[model samples]
Target: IVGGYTCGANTVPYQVSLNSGYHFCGGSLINSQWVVSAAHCYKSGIQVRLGEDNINVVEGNEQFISASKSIVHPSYNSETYNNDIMLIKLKSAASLNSRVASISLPTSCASAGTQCLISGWGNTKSSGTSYPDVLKCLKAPILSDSSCKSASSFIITSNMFCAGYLEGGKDACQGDSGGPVVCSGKLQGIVSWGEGCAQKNKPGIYTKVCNYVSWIKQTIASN
Candidate 1:
């Protein structure tokens, strides 16, 4: 979370840390038993920590749960990072409260220039080791599709979108993958990939959640 600050405890209740002794990726709770994350983060034996604000110490509000199953997007392309979304079914349903809850899925696509909040435990520095123990958040605006394509050397697919400053700074970095990008209180994006973390003209790219709304619903229903 470059150029961001520590978030208030339990403020982003839907946030979850994909932990394996250490925080690796971030995810969002969509329901009592399901979590939305990046497909690249999928692995066996994933442990999820809900209601976690800081990863360093024991925060009594946290709920440590294990994944029962993981379902990666069927068309996910790792090389291109398209369709980079995944869902995890928890071993048990989470107990929702002020510090632990689910976030609403997006009803429609977010337009360019829409301001959104991205929170995670990703590195604070782009070139050094400054991973935050506490969750950090940055406010970034969605970039126009054409502008996003022109700014990056990589292929910008329909399933992807960009958000952050072209001038550099304020973006998600390593350890933030699969985290929530909330717009208007809805889950609009999932931290997918980026070039060099907050670099100039290389804003953070995210999985466009609206495009997979049906897939998410269908997957949840069938599985």
Candidate 2:
């Protein structure tokens, strides 16, 4: 998956599993105490599953536990989209394995021409909800900040760093918000929104991971 989309562990169609039922948008465990993701995808009682090739089979596997606590981020404004970040406090430390690993949160991740990775269980063709069998991964080159600014000159703001194909193709869709934009094996950005998700003349717009480093650190610190 590229952009804000993800490749979820395989599960029954339309039947999300607790073992791997939930398709994650954006989340990365930083420590024993902190788990990071976007505020848009927050849902109470949502479970984070790991350590299985398929989303359905979790026999004899190791995974981490996280329960939704109070959401910790500024209120999301529908029109403005000021803050889309969120932090989750894990009930226990998650064990890492081939299926699950930590994606780094870098301070300077949203730079021009910087390649980034976007993974998720979103629609393979960006139309409706249909996660692919097994998990998928893809890498994309980050567009120059100025170039993105120029491309979205009519709408781009200082809050986002354009990260998508320059052909104006390939992007994340509606169910993609709050997904992680991993770059260089690090969690670099958050899938926010774009003019038209996965459209012919539109690219994904992710919240610049680097720009909000301090804000994230400070917010997490207070929590």
Candidate 3:
């Protein structure tokens, strides 16, 4: 995250690191056995690490679990990044505690102007390698669909929304994909894509989590 602050330990209990030997993406624990992430972050042999504060240190609260399965949205479009959400089923249910828990999914959609909290361990720079050892967070307001579309050079679909300053600054960059974009303590968006990390007239785009609530529930239930 650019222009972000380091998160307090255990402040975001629902946060998890999607790792394949190393942290590649972030995700939120939606339940004891299911996690929500960006479909674009999908890869085989993923291990979910919960209660992690600093990736460089061995935090006692951390719990590492392997993914039993991952289901990407069937209608997901890679070219446009539409329906970019994915669900990962844990091999075993997580043991919830003060440092490891699930976040509630939003029942209603968030409106424009609503400030949301985004957290990740993604690169700290728009360019170059500057990954953070500790998780970082930024508070950015959701932009109206029209404003978002106007600000972005890329196509902004109904399944996606934009957030962050119009002028370059704070944003989720590479390695932050599949992370949580939370509002009102609820999961609202998933870090998906953008033109560039925190660039002028190029806000960060997120997968509209509200649009896939039904699909998520159904997928979890059937599987």
Candidate 4:
């Protein structure tokens, strides 16, 4: 299964599984050996397939990126969804396909109000159903700081971002907690949480990757 549905610059979503047959969310490939995902996916060690949206990726398929370690964020909070960022190091990088290609990490001028794509196997309607076996995708706009704060009384920290459908029916689900919000093919955020999946005014929240660039580089270096 590909885990869940995430809406962003979702080019090639990484399907993560703690147990081989079961899955919950999608991740991103930052480099040949590193994958960007939400810390929540750390519930158990996961099996990953990069640049893919379906299960059982084969030869001549999209870039087949794999991970031996998850390198989750040290400070993760399930209650508040803080430090919701992490990475995956691939066993090796493979051939790129049309549907599978690497996106550069936009390290500059990337804060809020960024537009991107997200994908996962979580759910189509965010709260109604769990697409634990099927991969789905959608587009989303990054929320600005003031807008995000104005949207919720619960402070939107600097580590996290806010996003959702202005039109509803496009959001994340229980399983889409760790996918990518990619833009220009580069990752901008990692799915974290929301008040409720697909609530009329509510949207999905994520850890800002650009804000944690140093942490990302340092973590990868240490690993």
Candidate 5:
């Protein structure tokens, strides 16, 4: 996130490290065997890392699990970033511990202007090459649907939503895609896209988790 700082290990246990041979995107462990991320983050040979804080070097508590399956929304639109959510099925269930746990998904939709937080390992600056070895978090507020559209150049589709400030200091950046957007202690959104890192009035776009709850449940149940 732009203008963010390093976070303590285990502060956000549900935060996930998604690797495609190497660190590429962030994710959230929504269950022991399932992870929620962004469809745009999808790539071949994806792996999931749990109970991890640092990526440059390994800590003892980290558990790396191979992905057995990945499911992207059938209606997902790459051009428009609509329904940009994806789920990964772990080859084995994660061992739940204090340092590794699942986050709850909301039964209802997140309201606009609701306070929320986004944590990730994305770039600190828009053109930076380095990412934090440890997790980084930024405080953001959900923007109203109308306000989001007004501020953005793209059409704010219903499957997507916006979060961040109008002045734009803190935000999710490159390499932060597919991370969790937590609101009211629940998974509300997944980092999808943005015009750039923390551009003015262009709040980060996210896949609205509430709109895909039923699909998430049914997909997991069926598999």
Candidate 6:
């Protein structure tokens, strides 16, 4: 996240490092055996590292879990980034602890202007090409659909929403995809895409979790 501060140890236990041959994205452990991330973050050899603050070295609490299967939304549109959400079933369930747990899911859409948070190991600045090993966190506010649409020419589908400042000094940047956008201590969105990192008048877009709660529950029950 651009201009974000580094988080302390176990500050975000649900935050996981999603590695598609590289730790290029972030995710949230929704359950002991399931993780939520952006559909666009999926790749051929994806795995997840949970309960760790830093990615550079393995911590005693870190769990290197292999993925069983990745379930991307069937109606996902890569071009528009609609329904840009995915679930990854872990080969083995995560052992919950203070530093390894699941996050609560929101039952409905986030209210407009709701204060929220987003965290990841993405770049510290928009121009940076590298990600920091330490986890980073920042606050963003939910933007109304109408206001969000006005910021960009692209369609703001109901399945997708926006969160970030209108003046744009903070946001989920490159390598932050698939990370959770938490509001009122519940999972509200997933870092999906954006026009540019922290660009003025261009807030970061996310996969609205409320739009797919039914799908998520169905997937978990069936899988």
Give the per-residue lDDT digits (tens) of candidate 6, residues 175-199. Answer: 8999999998899999998888898
Q: What is the lDDT, from 0 to 100, of the residue 53 in candidate 2?
A: 41
TM-score for each prediction? 0.99, 0.76, 0.98, 0.80, 0.97, 0.97
Write down the lDDT of every candidate, Cα atoms only.
0.94, 0.58, 0.93, 0.63, 0.89, 0.89
Report the candidate with higher TM-score, 2 versus 4. 4
Between prediction 1 and prediction 2, the one with superior lDDT is 1
Q: Identify the superior model by TM-score, candidate 2 or candidate 5.
A: 5
Question: Using lDDT as the measure, which candidate wins?
Answer: 1
lDDT tens digits, residue span 143-223, model 5: 999989998888889988999987877889888899999999999999999888788888898889999889999999998
C-alpha lDDT of residue 127 in model 4: 41
If the candidates were sorted by their lDDT against the true structure, best first, what order would they fall in?
1, 3, 5, 6, 4, 2
lDDT of 3 by residue, 129-174 (tens): 7998988999999999999988878899999999888888889899
lDDT, candidate 1, at 86: 96
Between which residue pairs do clashes occur in model 3?
Answer: 38-178
Query: In model 1, what lDDT does residue 62 have?
Result: 88
Is 1 or 4 the stronger prediction by lDDT? 1
The residue pairs that clash in candidate 5, if any, are none
Model 4, runs deviating above 4 Å? 1-19, 56-66, 92-99, 109-112, 130-134
Single out the weakest 10-residue window by summed lDDT for candidate 2: 11-20
**Per-residue lDDT over 1-223 for candidate 1, one digit per residue giving the tens place of the 0 to 100 score:** 9998889998999999998878999999999999999999988889999999878889789899999999999999999999999999999999999999999998999989999999999899977878887889999999999999999999999999999999997899999999999999999999999999989899999999999999999999998
Instruction: Please provide, for model 4 over 1-223, each residue's C-alpha lDDT reduced to its tens digit, 9 standing for 90 to 100.
Output: 1223432222453333333456656676566566677887774446665544454444334353346776777787767777887677766664454555555676753545666777676656544553533356666778677767776657677787787664455666666677777766667777787776776666777778777878778887887
Prediction RMSDs, each to the true structure: 0.6, 5.0, 0.8, 4.0, 1.0, 1.0
Error of 5 at 153 (Å): 0.9
Error of 6 at 114 (Å): 1.1
